[PDB]
PDB file of C-alpha atoms and ligand atoms in Angstrom:
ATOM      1  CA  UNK A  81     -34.476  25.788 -25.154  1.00 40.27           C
ATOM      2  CA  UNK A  82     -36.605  24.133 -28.400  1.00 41.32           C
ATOM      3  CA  UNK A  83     -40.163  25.090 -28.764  1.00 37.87           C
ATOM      4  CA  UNK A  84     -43.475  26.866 -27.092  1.00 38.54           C
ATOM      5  CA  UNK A  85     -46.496  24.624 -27.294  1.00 39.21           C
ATOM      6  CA  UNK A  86     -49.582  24.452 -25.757  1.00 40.79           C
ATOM      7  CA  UNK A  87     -51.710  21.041 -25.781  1.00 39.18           C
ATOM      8  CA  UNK A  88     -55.420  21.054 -24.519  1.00 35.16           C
ATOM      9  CA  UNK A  89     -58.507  18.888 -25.282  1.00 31.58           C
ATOM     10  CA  UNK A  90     -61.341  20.881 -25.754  1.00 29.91           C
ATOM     11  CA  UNK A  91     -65.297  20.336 -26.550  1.00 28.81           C
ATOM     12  CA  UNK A  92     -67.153  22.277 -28.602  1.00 28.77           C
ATOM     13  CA  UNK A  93     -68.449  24.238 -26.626  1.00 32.70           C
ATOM     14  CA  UNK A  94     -64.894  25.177 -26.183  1.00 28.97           C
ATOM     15  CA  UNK A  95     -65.241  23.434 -22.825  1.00 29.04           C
ATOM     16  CA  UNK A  96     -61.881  22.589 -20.693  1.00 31.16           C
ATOM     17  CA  UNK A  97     -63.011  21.567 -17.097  1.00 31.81           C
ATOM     18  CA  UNK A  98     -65.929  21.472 -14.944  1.00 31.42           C
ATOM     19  CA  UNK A  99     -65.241  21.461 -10.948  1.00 33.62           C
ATOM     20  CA  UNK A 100     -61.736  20.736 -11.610  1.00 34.68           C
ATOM     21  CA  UNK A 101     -62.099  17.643 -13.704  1.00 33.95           C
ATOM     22  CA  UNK A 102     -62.242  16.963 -17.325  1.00 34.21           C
ATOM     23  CA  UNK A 103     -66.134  17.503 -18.752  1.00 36.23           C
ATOM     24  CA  UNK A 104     -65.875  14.229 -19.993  1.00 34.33           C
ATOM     25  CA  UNK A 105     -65.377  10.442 -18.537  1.00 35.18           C
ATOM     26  CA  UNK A 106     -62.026   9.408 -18.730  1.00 32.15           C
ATOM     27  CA  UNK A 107     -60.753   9.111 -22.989  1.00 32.16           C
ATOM     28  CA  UNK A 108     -58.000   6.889 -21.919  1.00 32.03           C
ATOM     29  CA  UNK A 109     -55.950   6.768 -25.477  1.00 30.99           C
ATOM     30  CA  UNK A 110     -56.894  10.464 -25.411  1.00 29.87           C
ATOM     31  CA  UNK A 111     -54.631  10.993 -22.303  1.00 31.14           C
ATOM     32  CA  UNK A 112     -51.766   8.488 -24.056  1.00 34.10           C
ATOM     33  CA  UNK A 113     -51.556  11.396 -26.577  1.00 33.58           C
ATOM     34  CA  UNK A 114     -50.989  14.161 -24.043  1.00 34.14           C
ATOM     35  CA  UNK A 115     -48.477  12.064 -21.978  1.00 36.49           C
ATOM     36  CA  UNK A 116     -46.367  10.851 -25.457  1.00 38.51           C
ATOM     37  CA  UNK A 117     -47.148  14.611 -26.812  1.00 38.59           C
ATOM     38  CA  UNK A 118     -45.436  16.304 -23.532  1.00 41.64           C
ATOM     39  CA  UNK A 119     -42.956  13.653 -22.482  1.00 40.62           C
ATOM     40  CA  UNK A 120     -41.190  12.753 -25.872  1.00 40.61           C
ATOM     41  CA  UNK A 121     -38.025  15.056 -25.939  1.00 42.66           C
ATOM     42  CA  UNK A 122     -36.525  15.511 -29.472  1.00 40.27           C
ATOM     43  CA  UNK A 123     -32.676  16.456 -27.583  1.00 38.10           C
ATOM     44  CA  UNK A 124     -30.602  14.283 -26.040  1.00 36.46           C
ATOM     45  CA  UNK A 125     -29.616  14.856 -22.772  1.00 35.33           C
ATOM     46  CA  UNK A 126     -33.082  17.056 -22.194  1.00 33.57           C
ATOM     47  CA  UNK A 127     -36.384  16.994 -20.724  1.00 33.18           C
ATOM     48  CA  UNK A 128     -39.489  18.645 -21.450  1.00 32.80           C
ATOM     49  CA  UNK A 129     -40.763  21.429 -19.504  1.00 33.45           C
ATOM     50  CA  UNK A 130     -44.869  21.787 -18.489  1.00 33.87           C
ATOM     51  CA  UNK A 131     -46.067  25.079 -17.454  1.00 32.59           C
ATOM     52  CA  UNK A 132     -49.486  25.066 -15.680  1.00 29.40           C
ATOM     53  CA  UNK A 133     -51.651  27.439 -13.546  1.00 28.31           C
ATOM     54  CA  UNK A 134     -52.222  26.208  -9.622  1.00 29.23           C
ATOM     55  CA  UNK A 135     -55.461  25.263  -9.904  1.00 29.13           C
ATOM     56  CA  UNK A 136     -54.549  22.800 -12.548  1.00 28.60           C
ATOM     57  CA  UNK A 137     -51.305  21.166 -10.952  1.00 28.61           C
ATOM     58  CA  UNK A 138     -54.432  20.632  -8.163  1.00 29.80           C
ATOM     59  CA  UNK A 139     -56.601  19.359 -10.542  1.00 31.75           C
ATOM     60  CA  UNK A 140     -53.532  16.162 -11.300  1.00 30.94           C
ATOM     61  CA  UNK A 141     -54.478  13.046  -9.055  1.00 29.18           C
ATOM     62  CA  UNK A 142     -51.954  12.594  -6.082  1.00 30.58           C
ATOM     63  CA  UNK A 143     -50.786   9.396  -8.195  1.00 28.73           C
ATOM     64  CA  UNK A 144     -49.887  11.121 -11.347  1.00 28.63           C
ATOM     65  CA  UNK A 145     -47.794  14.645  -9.478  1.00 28.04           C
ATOM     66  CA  UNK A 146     -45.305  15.505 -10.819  1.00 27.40           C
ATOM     67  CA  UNK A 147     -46.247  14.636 -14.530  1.00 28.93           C
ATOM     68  CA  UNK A 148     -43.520  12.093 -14.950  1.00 28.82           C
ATOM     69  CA  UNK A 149     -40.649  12.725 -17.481  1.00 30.34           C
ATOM     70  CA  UNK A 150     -40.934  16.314 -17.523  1.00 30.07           C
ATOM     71  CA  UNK A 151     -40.419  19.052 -15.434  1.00 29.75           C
ATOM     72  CA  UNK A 152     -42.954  20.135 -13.982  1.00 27.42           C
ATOM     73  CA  UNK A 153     -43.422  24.356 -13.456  1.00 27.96           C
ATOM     74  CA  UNK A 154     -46.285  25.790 -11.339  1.00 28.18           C
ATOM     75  CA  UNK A 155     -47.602  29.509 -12.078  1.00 29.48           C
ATOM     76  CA  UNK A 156     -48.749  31.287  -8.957  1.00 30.29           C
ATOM     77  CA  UNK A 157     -48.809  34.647  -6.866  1.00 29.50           C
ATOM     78  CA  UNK A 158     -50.153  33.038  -3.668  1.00 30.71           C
ATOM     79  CA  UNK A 159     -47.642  30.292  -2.950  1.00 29.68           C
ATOM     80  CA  UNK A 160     -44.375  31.069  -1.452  1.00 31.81           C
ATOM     81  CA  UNK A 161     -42.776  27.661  -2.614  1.00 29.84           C
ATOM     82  CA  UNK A 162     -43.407  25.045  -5.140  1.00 31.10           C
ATOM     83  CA  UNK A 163     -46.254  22.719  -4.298  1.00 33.15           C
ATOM     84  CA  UNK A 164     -45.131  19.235  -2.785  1.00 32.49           C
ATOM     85  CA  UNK A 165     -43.850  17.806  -5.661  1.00 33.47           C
ATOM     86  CA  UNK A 166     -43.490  20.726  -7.883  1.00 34.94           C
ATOM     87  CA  UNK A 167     -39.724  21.053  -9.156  1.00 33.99           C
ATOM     88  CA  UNK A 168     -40.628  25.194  -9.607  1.00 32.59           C
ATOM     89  CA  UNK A 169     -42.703  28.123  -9.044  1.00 32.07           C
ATOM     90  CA  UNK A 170     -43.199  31.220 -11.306  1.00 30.31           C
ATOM     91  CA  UNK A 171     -45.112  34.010 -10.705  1.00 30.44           C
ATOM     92  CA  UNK A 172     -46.145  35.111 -14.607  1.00 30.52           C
ATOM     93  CA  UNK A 173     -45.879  33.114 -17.477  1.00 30.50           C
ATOM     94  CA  UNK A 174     -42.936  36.058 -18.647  1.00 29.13           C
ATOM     95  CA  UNK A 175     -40.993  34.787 -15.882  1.00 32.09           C
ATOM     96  CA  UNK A 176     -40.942  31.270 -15.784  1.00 32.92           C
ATOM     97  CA  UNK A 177     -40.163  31.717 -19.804  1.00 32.17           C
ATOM     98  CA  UNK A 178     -36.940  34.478 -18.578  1.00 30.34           C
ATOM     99  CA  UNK A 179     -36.329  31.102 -16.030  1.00 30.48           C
ATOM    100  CA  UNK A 180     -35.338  28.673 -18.812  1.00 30.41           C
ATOM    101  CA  UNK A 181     -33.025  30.975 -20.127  1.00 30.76           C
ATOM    102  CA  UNK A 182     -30.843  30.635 -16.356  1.00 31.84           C
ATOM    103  CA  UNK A 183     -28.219  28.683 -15.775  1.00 29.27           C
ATOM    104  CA  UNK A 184     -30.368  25.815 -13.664  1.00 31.89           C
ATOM    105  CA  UNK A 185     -32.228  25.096 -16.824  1.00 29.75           C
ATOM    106  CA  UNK A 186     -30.746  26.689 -20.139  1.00 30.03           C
ATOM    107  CA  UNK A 187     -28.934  23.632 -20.777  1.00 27.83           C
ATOM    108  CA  UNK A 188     -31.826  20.593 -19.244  1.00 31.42           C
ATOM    109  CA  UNK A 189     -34.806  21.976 -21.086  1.00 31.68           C
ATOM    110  CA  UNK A 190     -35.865  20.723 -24.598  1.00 30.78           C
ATOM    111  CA  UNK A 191     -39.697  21.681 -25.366  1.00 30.41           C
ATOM    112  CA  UNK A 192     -41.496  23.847 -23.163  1.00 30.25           C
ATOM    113  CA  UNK A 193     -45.523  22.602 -23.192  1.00 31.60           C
ATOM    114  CA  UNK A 194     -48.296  24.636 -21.441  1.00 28.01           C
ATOM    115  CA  UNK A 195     -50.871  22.456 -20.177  1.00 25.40           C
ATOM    116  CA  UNK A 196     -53.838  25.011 -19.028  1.00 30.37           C
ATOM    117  CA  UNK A 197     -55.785  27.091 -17.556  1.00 28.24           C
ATOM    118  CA  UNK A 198     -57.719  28.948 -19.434  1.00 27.31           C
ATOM    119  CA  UNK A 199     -55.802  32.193 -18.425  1.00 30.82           C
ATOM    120  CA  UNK A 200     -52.137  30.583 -19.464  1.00 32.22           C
ATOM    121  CA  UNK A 201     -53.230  29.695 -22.553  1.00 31.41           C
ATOM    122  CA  UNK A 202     -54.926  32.999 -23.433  1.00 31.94           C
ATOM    123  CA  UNK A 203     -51.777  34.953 -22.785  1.00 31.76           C
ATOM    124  CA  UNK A 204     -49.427  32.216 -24.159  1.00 34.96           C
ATOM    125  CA  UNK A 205     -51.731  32.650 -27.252  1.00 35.36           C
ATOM    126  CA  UNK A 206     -51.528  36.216 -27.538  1.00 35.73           C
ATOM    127  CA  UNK A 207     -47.865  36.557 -26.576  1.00 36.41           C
ATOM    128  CA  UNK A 208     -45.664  37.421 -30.147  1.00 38.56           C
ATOM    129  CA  UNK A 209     -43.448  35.015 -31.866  1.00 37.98           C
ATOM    130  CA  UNK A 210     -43.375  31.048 -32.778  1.00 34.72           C
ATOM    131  CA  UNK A 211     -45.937  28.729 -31.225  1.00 32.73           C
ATOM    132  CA  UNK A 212     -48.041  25.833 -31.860  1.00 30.44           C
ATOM    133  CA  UNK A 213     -51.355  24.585 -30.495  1.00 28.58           C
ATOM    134  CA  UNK A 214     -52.042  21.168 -30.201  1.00 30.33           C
ATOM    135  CA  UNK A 215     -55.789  20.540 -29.898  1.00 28.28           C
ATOM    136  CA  UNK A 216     -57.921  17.825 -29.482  1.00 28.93           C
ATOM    137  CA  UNK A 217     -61.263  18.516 -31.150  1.00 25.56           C
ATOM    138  CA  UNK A 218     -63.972  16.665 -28.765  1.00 25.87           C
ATOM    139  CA  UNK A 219     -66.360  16.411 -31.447  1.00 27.39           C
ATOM    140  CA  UNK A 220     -69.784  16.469 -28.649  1.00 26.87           C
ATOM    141  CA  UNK A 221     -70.994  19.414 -26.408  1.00 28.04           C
ATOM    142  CA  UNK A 222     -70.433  18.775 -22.612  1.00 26.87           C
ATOM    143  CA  UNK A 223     -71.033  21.137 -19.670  1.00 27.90           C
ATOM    144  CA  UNK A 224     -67.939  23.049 -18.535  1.00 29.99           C
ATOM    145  CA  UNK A 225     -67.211  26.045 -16.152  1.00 33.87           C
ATOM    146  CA  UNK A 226     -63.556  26.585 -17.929  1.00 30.73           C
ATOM    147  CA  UNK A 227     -63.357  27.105 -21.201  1.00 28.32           C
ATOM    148  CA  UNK A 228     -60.397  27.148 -23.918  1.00 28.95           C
ATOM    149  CA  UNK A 229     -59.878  31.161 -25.441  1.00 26.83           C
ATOM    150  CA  UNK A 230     -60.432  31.573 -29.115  1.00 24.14           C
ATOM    151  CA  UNK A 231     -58.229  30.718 -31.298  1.00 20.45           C
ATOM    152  CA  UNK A 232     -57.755  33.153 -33.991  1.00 20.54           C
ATOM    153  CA  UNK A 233     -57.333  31.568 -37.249  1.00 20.09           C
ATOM    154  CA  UNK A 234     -55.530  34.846 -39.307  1.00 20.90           C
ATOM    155  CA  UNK A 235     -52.803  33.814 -37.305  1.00 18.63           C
ATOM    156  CA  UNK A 236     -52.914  30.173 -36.798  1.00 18.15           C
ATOM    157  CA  UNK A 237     -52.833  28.150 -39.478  1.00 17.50           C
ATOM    158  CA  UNK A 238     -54.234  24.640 -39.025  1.00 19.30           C
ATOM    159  CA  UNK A 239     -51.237  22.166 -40.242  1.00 18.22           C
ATOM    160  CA  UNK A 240     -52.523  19.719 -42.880  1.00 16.66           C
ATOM    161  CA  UNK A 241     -50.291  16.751 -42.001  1.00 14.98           C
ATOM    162  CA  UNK A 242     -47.895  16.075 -38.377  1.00 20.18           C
ATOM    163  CA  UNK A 243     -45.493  13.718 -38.260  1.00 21.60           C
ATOM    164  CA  UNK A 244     -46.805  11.560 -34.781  1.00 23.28           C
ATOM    165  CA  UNK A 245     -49.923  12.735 -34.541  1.00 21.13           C
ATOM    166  CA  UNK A 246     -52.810  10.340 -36.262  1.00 22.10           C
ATOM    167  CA  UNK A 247     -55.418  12.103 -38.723  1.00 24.10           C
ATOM    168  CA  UNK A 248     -58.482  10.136 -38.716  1.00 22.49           C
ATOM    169  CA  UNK A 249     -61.222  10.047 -36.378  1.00 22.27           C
ATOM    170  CA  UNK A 250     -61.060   8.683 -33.088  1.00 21.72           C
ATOM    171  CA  UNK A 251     -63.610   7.213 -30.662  1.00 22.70           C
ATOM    172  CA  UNK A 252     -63.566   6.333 -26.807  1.00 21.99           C
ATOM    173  CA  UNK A 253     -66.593   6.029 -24.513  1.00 23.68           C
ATOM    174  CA  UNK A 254     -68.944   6.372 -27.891  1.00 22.74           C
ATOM    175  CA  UNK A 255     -67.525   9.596 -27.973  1.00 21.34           C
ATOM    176  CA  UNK A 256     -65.347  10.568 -31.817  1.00 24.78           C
ATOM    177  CA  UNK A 257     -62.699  13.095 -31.177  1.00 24.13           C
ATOM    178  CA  UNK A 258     -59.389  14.047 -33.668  1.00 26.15           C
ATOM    179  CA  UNK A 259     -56.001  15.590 -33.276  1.00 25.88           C
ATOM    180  CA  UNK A 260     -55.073  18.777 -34.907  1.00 25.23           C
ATOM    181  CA  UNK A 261     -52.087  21.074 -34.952  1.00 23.24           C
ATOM    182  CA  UNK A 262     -51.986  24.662 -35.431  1.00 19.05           C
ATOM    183  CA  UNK A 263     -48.903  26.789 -35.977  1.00 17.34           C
ATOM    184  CA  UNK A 264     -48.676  30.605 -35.899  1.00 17.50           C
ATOM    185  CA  UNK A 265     -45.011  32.851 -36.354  1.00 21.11           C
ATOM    186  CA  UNK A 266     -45.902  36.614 -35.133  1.00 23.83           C
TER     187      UNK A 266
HETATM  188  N1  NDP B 413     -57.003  20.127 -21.790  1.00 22.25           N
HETATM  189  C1  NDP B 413     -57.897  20.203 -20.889  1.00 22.25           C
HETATM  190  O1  NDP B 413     -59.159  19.773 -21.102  1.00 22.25           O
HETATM  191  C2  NDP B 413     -57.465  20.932 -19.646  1.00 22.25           C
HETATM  192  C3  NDP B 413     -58.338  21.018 -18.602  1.00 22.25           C
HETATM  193  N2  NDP B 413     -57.914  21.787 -17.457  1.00 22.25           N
HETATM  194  C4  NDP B 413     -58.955  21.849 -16.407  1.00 22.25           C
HETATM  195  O2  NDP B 413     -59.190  23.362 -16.361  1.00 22.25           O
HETATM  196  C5  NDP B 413     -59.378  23.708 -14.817  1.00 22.25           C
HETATM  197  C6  NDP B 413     -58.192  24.563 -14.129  1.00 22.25           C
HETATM  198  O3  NDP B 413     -58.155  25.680 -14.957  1.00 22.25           O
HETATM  199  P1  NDP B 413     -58.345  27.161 -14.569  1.00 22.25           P
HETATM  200  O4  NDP B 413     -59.604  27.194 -13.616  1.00 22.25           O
HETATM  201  O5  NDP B 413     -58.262  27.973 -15.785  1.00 22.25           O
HETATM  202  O6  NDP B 413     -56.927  27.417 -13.719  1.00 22.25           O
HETATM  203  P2  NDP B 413     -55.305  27.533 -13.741  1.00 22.25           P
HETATM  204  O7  NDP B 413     -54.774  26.234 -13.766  1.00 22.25           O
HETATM  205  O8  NDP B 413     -54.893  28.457 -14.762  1.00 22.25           O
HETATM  206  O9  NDP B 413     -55.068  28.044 -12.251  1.00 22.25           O
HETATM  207  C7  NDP B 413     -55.441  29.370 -11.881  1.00 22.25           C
HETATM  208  C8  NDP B 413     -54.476  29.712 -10.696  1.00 22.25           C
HETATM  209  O10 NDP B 413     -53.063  29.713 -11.255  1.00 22.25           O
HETATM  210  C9  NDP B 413     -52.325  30.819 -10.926  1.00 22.25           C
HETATM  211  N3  NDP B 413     -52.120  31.430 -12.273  1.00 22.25           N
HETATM  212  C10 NDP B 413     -52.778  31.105 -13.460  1.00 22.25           C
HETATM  213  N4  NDP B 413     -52.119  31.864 -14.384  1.00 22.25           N
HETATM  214  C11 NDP B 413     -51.046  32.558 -13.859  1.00 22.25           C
HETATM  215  C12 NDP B 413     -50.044  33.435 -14.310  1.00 22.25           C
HETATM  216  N5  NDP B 413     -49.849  33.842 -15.620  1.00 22.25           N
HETATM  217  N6  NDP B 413     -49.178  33.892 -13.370  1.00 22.25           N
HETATM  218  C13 NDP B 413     -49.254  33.508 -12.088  1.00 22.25           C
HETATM  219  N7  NDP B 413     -50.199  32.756 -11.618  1.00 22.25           N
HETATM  220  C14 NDP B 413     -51.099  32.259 -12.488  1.00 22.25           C
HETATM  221  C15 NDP B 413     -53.291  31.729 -10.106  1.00 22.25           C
HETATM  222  O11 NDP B 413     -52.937  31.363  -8.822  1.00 22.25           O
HETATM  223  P3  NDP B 413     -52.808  32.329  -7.630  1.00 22.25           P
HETATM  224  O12 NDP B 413     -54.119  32.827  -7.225  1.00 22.25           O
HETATM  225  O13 NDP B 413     -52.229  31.469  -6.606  1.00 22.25           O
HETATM  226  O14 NDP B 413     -51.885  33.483  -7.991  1.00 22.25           O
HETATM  227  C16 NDP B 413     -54.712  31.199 -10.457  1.00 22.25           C
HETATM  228  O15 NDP B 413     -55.739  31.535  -9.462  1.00 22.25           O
HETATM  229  C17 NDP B 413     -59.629  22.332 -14.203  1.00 22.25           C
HETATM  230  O16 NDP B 413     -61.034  22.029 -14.544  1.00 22.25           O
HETATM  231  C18 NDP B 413     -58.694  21.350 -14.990  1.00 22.25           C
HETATM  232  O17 NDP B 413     -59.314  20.020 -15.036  1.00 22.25           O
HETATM  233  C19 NDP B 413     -56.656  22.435 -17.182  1.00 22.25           C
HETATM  234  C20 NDP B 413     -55.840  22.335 -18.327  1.00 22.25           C
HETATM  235  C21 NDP B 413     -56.225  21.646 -19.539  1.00 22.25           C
HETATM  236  C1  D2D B 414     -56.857  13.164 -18.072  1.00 23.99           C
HETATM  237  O1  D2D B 414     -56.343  14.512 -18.135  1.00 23.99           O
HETATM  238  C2  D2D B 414     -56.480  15.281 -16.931  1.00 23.99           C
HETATM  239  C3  D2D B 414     -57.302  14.811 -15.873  1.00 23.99           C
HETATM  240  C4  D2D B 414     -57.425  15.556 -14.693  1.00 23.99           C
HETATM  241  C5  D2D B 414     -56.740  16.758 -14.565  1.00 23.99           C
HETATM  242  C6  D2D B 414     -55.902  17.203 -15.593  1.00 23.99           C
HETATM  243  C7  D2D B 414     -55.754  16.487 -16.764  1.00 23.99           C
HETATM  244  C8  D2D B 414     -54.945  16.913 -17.863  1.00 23.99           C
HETATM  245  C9  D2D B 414     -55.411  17.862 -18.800  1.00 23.99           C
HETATM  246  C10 D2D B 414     -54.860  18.222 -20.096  1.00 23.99           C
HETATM  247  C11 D2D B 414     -54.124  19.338 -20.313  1.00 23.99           C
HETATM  248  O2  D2D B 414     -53.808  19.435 -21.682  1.00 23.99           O
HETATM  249  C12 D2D B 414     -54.362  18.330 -22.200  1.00 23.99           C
HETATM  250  N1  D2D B 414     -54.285  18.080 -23.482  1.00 23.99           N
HETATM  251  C13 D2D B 414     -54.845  16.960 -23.912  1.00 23.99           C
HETATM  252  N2  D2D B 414     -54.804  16.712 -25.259  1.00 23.99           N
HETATM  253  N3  D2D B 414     -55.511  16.070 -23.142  1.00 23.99           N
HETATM  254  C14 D2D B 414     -55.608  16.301 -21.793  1.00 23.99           C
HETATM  255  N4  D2D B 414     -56.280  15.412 -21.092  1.00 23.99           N
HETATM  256  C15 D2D B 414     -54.997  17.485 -21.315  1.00 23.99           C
HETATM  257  C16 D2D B 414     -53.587  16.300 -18.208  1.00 23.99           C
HETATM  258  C17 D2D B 414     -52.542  16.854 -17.143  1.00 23.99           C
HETATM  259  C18 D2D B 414     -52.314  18.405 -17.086  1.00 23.99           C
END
């Protein structure tokens, strides 16, 4: 298995959702980044793996479940079975990590991304050893009732160049955003 990531977009006011949608309207080059981010698979032969919380496999329209390309990896403790249209179910982010290591997927996953909530990414975050964060920088405030966890920058250093991923400011809706990648080894 290649990599741990996690992608988000994020306002700042650190916002991530509000009543299960994004805070803002719809940044539609914005989600071109996530889907080319998550779905391009530097392996042949592999896929990339997303992990993400219940509530925000729920919070994917009908349409666009499963997140094509990839497979897609629900966290709960509630559900007995993979949602309808899930490929798998984990009950802690430790074992759907121990999971890619098996047999089933060892040799079929290439990058494993974690695409929210707020609770993944905290303990994906705070969990020792090799992992990037790519974060879109929503450069407005917007009301939220999720928010992204702190990033802690002794430990993750904000890269100064990524191949893929543009530099400059962007702007969608009259709203500017940028890309940025940070990279910690613990
Ligand atoms: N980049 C962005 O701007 C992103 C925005 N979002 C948005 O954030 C919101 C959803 O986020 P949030 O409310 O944090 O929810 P989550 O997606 O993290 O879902 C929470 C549910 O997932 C299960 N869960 C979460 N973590 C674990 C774990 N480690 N082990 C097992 N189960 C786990 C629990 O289910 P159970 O009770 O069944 O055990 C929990 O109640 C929506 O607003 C969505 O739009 C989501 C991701 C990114
Ligand atoms: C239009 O985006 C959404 C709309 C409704 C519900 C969920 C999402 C998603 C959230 C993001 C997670 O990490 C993300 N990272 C980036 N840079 N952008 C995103 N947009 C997301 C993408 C799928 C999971």
């Amino acid at each position: 298995v290649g990599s741990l990531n996690c992608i988000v977009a994020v306002s700042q006011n650190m916002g991530i959702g509000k009543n299960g949608d994004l805070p803002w309207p719809p940044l539609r080059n914005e989600f071109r980044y996530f889907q080319r981010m998550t779905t391009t698979s530097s392996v042949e032969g592999k896929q990339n793996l997303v992990i993400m919380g219940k509530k925000t496999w729920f919070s994917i329209p009908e349409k666009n479940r499963p997140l094509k390309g990839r497979i897609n990896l629900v966290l709960s403790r509630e559900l007995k079975e993979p949602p309808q249209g899930a490929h798998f179910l984990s009950r802690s982010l430790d074992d759907a990590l121990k999971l890619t290591e098996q047999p089933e997927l060892a040799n079929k996953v290439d990058m494993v991304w974690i695409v929210g909530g707020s609770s993944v990414y905290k303990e994906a975050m705070n969990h020792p050893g090799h992992l990037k964060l790519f974060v879109t920088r929503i450069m407005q405030d917007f009301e939220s009732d999720t928010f992204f966890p702190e990033i802690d920058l002794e430990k993750y250093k904000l890269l100064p160049e990524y191949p893929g991923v543009l530099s400059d400011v962007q702007e969608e809706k009259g709203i500017k955003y940028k890309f940025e990648v940070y990279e910690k080894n613990d």
